[PDB]
Design a protein around this ligand. Structure first.
Ligand SMILES: O=C(NCc1ccc2c(c1)OCO2)c1c(Cl)cccc1Cl
Ligand SMILES: O=C(NCc1ccc2c(c1)OCO2)c1c(Cl)cccc1Cl
Ligand SMILES: O=C(NCc1ccc2c(c1)OCO2)c1c(Cl)cccc1Cl
Ligand code: NA
Ligand code: NA
Ligand code: NA
Ligand code: NA
Lengths: 494, 495, 494, 494
């Protein structure tokens, strides 16, 4: 049950957010953001640059000063505030789902039922962590009392992508604020709007000024400013593998700030011959096509055992051909447009590359509409490991199906990747499942499911898919600094 | 490693009461005989501790626990060193202790050596590593305060251990209590005090301060009951029959509100799905029931077998029980030794006669295996029904119950229809069946495609009437730890 | 600020709460509850007994059945429910605060600012714990995958005292529900009203029927029925130590149910000569007299170093004499009546006992008013360790001041007690504080403060003051069962 | 209680350690290691370069392969091996302490009682962690079973310094091997000998070949090759802040490997007017001069309250003048030589800068012997914040004493540093101790003591002092990779 969408949501916030106030760029420059369904400009947005980031970092640093409201505040109260934000986001849930859909392209039903639900669950989960992340009292040798405090890292720079604007914002803000940090956040030029509105609610919820600061703008400018800043303590970045290198380089050439990265992937989805066919087919479709295919953990390498290959493919093509593409605000729409023109063209490039290399086109393969960046759900069969489409992140509605024989074989082929973000195993066999989840070199391994995310369970990549983890108790460690205090005592006893 | 040839008649060097690192006679000067179950002959006399010797033990322990004492001041890391030393000393005397364990208890020497001793060693060494790693917390309390917790020793811990695993039970008790800075007054089984008393000697040699560990051999209703009722015992831990754990607890509740943990009986279900690996399932089910002469609280004493494989399984099961070699525990061919004593001997025989009378199908064995010693034939009952006494009551002997079932919903309900809940097992190749069953079974430990798999790392304990609280793992430390909160006014609290 | 109270609040809930339903006793019996300030009957309340307990237990068992809504419910959602309950409670904060004062006698200002706030903070704390109490994956020897599940204990009997009716309810429900248990709760016959109103809010919050059942009645009847019930998996009791020994006895001869107890105390409050005099004096007054002296952790043995003893006693007597006793609804009132005639009489007896013992009566010592159960703030000086008033829990506004010379001396004297619930030290010296915080045999040691409770920090007794802990992560341990699952795997790797 | 030293220990191991075998450098080149007490060459050592690092890494990768002896080994057994290694090191304790002194210069008595003891305690501490670092079972939403495996990070590059050759090696090997990692370790060109002997003991203990590989050589060559390697999964560096940057840059332009740094410091040692004079003076001397002043956490900024400043400075100078410099093998020697000519000249240069900037040279300040790199214990008084010697890590026997007035003042000046490795407070006051321990921006705060290390308490810096922690349970985090496994189940229940 979903409330009727306002298909033309008004935009209220489009400037830079610092100290709970709205600011034009120092330069007074602005940039257009576009509706990827129509190609029409939604509105102009403040274009943040190095000098704007400087203002934002200075505001955060002051907010973080010892004895400030934010620093003195009860941990439990940081929790109440996160809970209040959740309630405000829920109050304006219909509006935000619509705004997300307008700015990003994903179906309003998914924005509402998935993205918005997950945002509420993430903030609410982390609200609970604010006063429960304990330090230790330590049985150290000698006549001493030793213990640790789990202190905030400090000023945290956070750069989030366009594929899940609201959710990614929440994945970052939850652990950061629960642990008492202050934030300087750069949002994607493609999808700045929803985050800017949330900043208004952050103000409304009662967060002290300077605790959260959002600077819309371009990456080569605003993003690198954060990563290179001499007073930023930590930088978390979710984006492509390409941009990620550009960040850790800039971040290491400054003040030795802490760095975490959530990057691309080429995740294998393995279908053993004893898997439930109907289930494995629907899940493989879901695994790849979700969010217009725009997921780092997309199941973009579908390994199918030879004995069931033909039937699996047969059933998969029918499912991809029945996938409804169109107006994101139509309840019946399964697939919206790609986020922008640059993505649109790049996806079409990979499709054409697939054909040249001898992959077998089974459906789609071309443009799905003359208006907006709609691409047809595309499926490639008989893919081989050495193909570009088998190796590179496409980030589009393009599915690759490979055939294997043995379980030992597929382990080697699934693991032969510079990526290692996620993987899946579909089988009914207890031993096969335990064998594969242990042997697969990925941060998350799903068994008989896919894209199962909980605020409670960590997500992150092995290898070149990134470092560190988000979500769960683990997501706190990156936003925490350990101080050991060791006190001479008259006589230590047990 | 290879099993060294055993001295089949090892000498006894310790048979008295151990208090403050010294050997005592009982006050009454009374001693009692401990028997060799393989021959029925007396091994030696053992000082017979009673309440008055327990009072000496508790006084001793209390003194060693005093603020400023060597034990209380000792670095936690050092308590770990002490535990490793003890382990090193036991490994030195492993051949001797393994043989002594066989002499006093009856279990095959090869098993004492390769199983019991290895597990004792692994248990002590594991907890040696916990000594300096069980942290309290610092806590982000509201207001201008600094709040933290100290995990302090619970104090004077009375520990009563059974006879089925004398060395191992000792280790399971000493490991966590010593790692966390406690002192102990231990009462060992009258059937098997010898090995525990020799280890008391090793505890001295290892360097533990006097009074940290005190051992009082004696009888249950006297020595054991005195620990449970003592006004200066802070914790009592009892492993044994469900029947006696009831008594022990009843005593603790009427004394000083001491902390109590129990490790009691069971009638654990071993569930064989039709898709199980047959040969594997057959050998594991045999092991699951017959191990240690069937003398395990977690014995797989209700063998549920899916109807399609029932006949084959029962046939293979009876073949294996028929081939199981019973005899002298020092002969390497022996898989089964005598039961622990005559009382058990007869109780098991009684249960067998009950099973026959109540209409269970006697498939093999069924009576005495030798004229001398407490040897019983490995016994298998087929067509066992839930309502039968032998399907309900713990037998603690080499008596196997095999029950037929049809569906997975059926077996879960039947397995869970028990006052016990110590352990359970599931043999199947299907992921969903394993997961469905491991979640649904009301048992403290669930084994999947294996049985009797223990590790110092993984907690062990029962649901329902099989006791309360756990042993082993990090959880074993909780029952031996006391939490103190210290909350301090500070000038200005900041994150 | 504090809103004006309705001094004659209406009563809505006075029956037995089972399956979200209000029931009369099977016997149709009711009992009168009395207003301690006036000695007048407030209303009649259903008198539950063994048959009513038996119905409650059955309902709880049924709600706890595998596949039930409460068992299948996401842990995070149990969290939502506790937060909703807290919200409904805060909604009715002004009303519940007045009802608490009417039935119990404590000053309304304190019911509102202390009791009700701590109730809210408690439930909101545990809401956070619902989906964060993880089991473990364990590196066991051999080719095995071993892990633990932290399952609920099941049907939990909870018996709560009359001194903090609402807060003790929360201390019990928070952890039990966060961990997925079901509850059969016996409330005190002196103060059943506020707890019954909360049950109404538990139904309104959306808790499934049977998850919380509340049976008002008497101890020898309803209480013993819970403790002795064959189908109750755990019993938690807070109250006098004598009655605690009975509850622990009932559980032993039934079904080996897990029992935790929170019992009495005779907590030492240690004042070193280097302490802040003004703070120490006001804190020692607070520590003994708070809640009409009706706290098990009351600082009922005030040890004062001999060099500041004369001055401390002077200030302490003056403070006691100025303490305003009267209508708990008058904002000027610091001290209401004792909870009932039985307590009233007990306190009078203890006062006389001290007098006959040769303790010096420095002020008070009699009845403070005609109506209700009011007792004059009373102070004894030159108290000795062997005195009955120095050893037994008085649970009234009766202060015991003792003189000591050295720190090594006061440690011994402080510890020479069969109780061990709490302790405090007042000093400015770092080493003195550490020495004493380590040496005192108490579950809680306060330094330069007293009665500082936080939802995050555990509370419970050493020795005969009880077993187990409430509050904090520790509060969850008693409400969880550990299950180990150990699985054979093909080949264990790190 | 110290065994007599062999003042000329024989060298048995001087090559590259790969696969438990001793290797010459590919180029066959070698370099001299010097005795800093005599300036004379002890012996030549294999000069490993990029090609050799390449061999070692391949060796490590092979030992880490799924199904290998190290990967299949019981975790408890990894612990048994660490204990065996510790026992072997204890067997050869006299020899190792003598060789440490010979190569490094530290007093033999210190090498024996401090260094080797701490080495033993570190290896034994972590041996105990081997089978106790659990993953989690997670109460995720939905019908799933979700859990984490704590897997090894893989091939770990470890570059260690020359100030604590043996202890540093153990600080790295302990956590790394306890978690099942494999290691390529680069030892200091100045002190490579003891570490290579320890590798012979690693072979003796029974560690599978390729689990530990040691490549002696130079920083710009061997050290850089490790950091830039495309098959190294993690890099841990300890040394100057300068080189730490080089490492973090090289380690970012390669394969996004994990990086932890332990860098320099300029740690504030704060003496309040109510401190114990005798104790504070001896401890401030220890804090600075320990190990020829060669400790990153040295108390190289001694702040003294003006009321006690004069007396503290007088006592400190007297103690510095009394410090015995000489042959490290002489039981009376308190201070040996600096590590090498480079450091020798660098410290004398800092001394020169100190005099040129107008800090009061109170004692020492020159060369202490005609042979070897001995420098007199030096004390500067009236040091100001803006002086080079008050800002830069000197890493030698050069003490700075500063005057302050208020606790608010000293807090601001102590934190006014790009370094935050450690700090200390000497006071008898409870409140002052707590205010400072919280306010000081350092990774370790000592109260009424200094340089108190325990295997159990974590160590590491804030800001430019590095990232991450060593020792304790936290020391395990940088060596662990988290895999989340999420499994579809029939019907989830609590
Ligand atoms: O709808 C779901 N995932 C969609 C999804 C895919 C990729 C994502 C994501 C959500 O969040 C970030 O990346 C989903 C499902 Cl089927 C089961 C459990 C929990 C969740 Cl959240
Ligand atoms: O008001 C307080 N305590 C009063 C109090 C006394 C005894 C109690 C209690 C509260 O809760 C149960 O027992 C109080 C104080 Cl002075 C400081 C910090 C936090 C709190 Cl909650
Ligand atoms: O000798 C000690 N520190 C000397 C020391 C200084 C700097 C260090 C170190 C040891 O290890 C690495 O850095 C020391 C002390 Cl006084 C007390 C407790 C534990 C320790 Cl280990
Ligand atoms: Na857009
Ligand atoms: Na015997
Ligand atoms: Na009342
Ligand atoms: Na050298």
């Amino acid at each position: 049950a979903v409330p009727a969408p306002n298909q033309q949501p008004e935009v209220f916030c489009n400037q830079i957010f610092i100290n709970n106030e709205w600011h034009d760029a120092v330069s007074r420059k602005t940039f257009p953001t576009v509706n990827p369904s129509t190609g029409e400009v939604i509105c102009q947005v403040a274009e943040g640059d190095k000098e704007d980031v400087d203002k934002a970092v200075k505001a955060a640093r002051a907010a973080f000063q010892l004895g400030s409201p934010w620093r003195r505040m009860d941990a439990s109260h940081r929790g109440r505030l996160l809970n209040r934000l959740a309630d405000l986001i829920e109050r304006d849930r219909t509006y935000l789902a619509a705004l997300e859909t307008l700015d990003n392209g994903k179906p309003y039903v998914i924005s509402y039922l998935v993205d918005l639900d997950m945002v509420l669950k993430c903030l609410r989960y982390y609200a609970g962590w604010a006063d429960k992340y304990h330090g230790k009292t330590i049985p150290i040798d000698g006549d001493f009392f030793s213990y640790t405090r789990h202190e905030p890292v400090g000023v945290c720079g956070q750069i989030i992508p366009w594929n899940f604007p609201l959710l990614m914002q929440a994945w970052k803000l939850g652990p950061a604020l629960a642990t008492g940090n202050v934030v300087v956040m750069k949002v994607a030029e493609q999808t700045p709007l929803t985050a800017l509105y949330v900043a208004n609610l952050i103000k409304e919820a009662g967060f002290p000024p300077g605790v959260v600061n959002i600077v819309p703008g371009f990456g080569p400018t605003a993003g690198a400013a954060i990563a290179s800043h001499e007073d930023v303590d930590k930088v978390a970045f979710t984006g492509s593998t390409e941009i990620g290198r550009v960040i850790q380089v800039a971040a290491g050439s400054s003040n030795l700030k802490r760095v975490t990265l959530e990057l691309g992937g080429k995740s294998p989805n393995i279908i053993m011959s004893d898997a439930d066919m109907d289930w494995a087919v629907e899940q493989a479709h879901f695994a790849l096509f979700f969010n217009q295919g725009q997921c780092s953990c997309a199941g973009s390498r579908t390994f199918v055992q030879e004995d069931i290959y033909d039937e699996f493919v047969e059933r998969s093509v029918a499912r991809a051909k029945s996938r409804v593409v169109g107006n994101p605000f139509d309840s019946k729409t399964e697939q919206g447009p790609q986020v922008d023109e640059t993505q649109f063209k790049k996806i079409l490039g990979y499709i054409n590359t697939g054909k040249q290399e001898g992959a077998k086109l089974l459906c789609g393969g071309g443009i799905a509409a003359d208006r907006g960046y709609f691409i047809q759900p595309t499926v490639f069969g008989d893919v081989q490991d050495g193909m570009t489409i088998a190796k590179e992140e496409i980030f589009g509605p393009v599915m690759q199906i490979l055939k294997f024989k043995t379980i030992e074989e597929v382990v080697g082929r699934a693991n032969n990747s510079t990526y290692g973000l996620a993987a899946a195993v579909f089988t009914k066999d207890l031993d096969k499942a335990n064998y594969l989840s242990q042997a697969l070199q990925a941060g998350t391994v799903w068994v008989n499911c896919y894209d199962v995310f909980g605020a409670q369970s960590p997500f992150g990549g092995y290898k070149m898919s990134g470092s560190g983890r988000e979500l769960g108790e683990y997501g706190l460690q990156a936003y925490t600094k350990v101080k050991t205090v060791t006190v001479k005592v008259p006589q230590k006893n047990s």
